[PDB]
Design a protein around this ligand. Structure first.
Ligand code: HEC
Ligand code: HEC
Lengths: 104, 104
């Protein structure tokens, strides 16, 4: 496998949701450091879907190859969920901005 | 509603997938200009999910307040699916980079 190319692909298709650095922060997705040898859905502090939580497989070259070709196929139920906004005043302020900008 | 606050929220939580300016572009999500007083899934040239496409309700403060607190709940089926990496060589390259970066 070609590392330099893989780095570019990661930066374009994955970096937006995942960090790989040790101690890396969780974003939309979980930090991926120490991924090889780790079972699905074990990154401490992250909230996985039951699908990702129960896949029951170990991440490594082979599993990643199948998974990466089509995530939903390998782990039916895996998806990105649009983060809700629980605070009422925040939703009110956001809508006020939306009402103005989407109409100007 | 506090426009100034909504503006910051929008930019930090929504701008990455949505643009609101008239003639704006579609990103991971559709441009939201003209959103109010119009039914769901009406953005020209954007392919929504059947879920978002058939919610049928009309966007306005009321409906937006309920939707924003929990998208999935107000529109069962709305989500983002993880795109696969069709090219076998890219998957290999990506995996090599991950193997390097997640251990170092
Ligand atoms: C956000 C829009 C993401 C993009 C783009 C990518 N992934 Fe992701 N990934 C994301 C989340 C929120 C999740 C968990 C979803 C769930 O079902 O709970 C994941 C998970 C993974 C995993 C598994 C991690 C684990 O089990 O600990 C891997 C290995 C993974 N994603 C890899 C990955 C790569 C390499 C991406 C680009 C090709 C990529 N993801 C993009 C969110 C997002
Ligand atoms: C990218 C990950 C997104 C983020 C972050 C936000 N939204 Fe989004 N939004 C996104 C998509 C891909 C879709 C459509 C999905 C589908 O089911 O087809 C949407 C949809 C909306 C809509 C409805 C548009 C319509 O009915 O025409 C609204 C009102 C909306 N999104 C608003 C919104 C706001 C204000 C966000 C941040 C607070 C936000 N979304 C983030 C993708 C993404």
């Amino acid at each position: 496998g070609d590392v330099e190319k893989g780095k570019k692909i990661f930066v374009q298709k994955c970096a937006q949701c995942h960090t790989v650095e040790k101690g890396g922060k969780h974003k939309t997705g979980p930090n991926l450091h120490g991924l090889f040898g780790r079972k699905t859905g074990q990154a401490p502090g992250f909230t996985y879907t039951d699908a990702n939580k129960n896949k029951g497989i170990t991440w490594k070259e082979e599993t990643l190859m199948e998974y990466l070709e089509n995530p939903k196929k390998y782990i039916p139920g895996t998806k990105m969920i649009f983060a809700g906004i629980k605070k009422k005043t925040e939703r009110e302020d956001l809508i006020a901005y939306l009402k103005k900008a989407t109409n100007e």
